[PDB]
Amino acid sequence: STENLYFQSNADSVQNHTFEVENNTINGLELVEEQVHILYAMVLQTHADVQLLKEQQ
């Protein structure tokens, strides 16, 4: 059953690579979200500086 075993191995490979694509994509989303957090903090800090400048002006 060499061929059927091979085609089964192929089926398993496609399935496992799908799991990997899914893991990569979830991981990428999480990384982008970490970037969002950083931008958000930078934006809040800049806003604070701007608020003081407006008070001083």
Partner: protein, 37 residues
């Protein structure tokens, strides 16, 4: 400083995401090729 540290983290994340997207596309391409075998 606070700002420099944010810049460093953002830039490291840039690299991480680039490599992650490449990996995702490579795994997808592998699965497609195997399925069509």
């Amino acid at each position: 400083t606070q700002w420099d540290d944010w810049v460093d983290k953002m830039e490291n994340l840039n690299h991480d995401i680039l490599t992650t997207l490449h990996t995702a596309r490579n795994n997808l391409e592998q699965s497609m090729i195997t399925f069509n075998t």
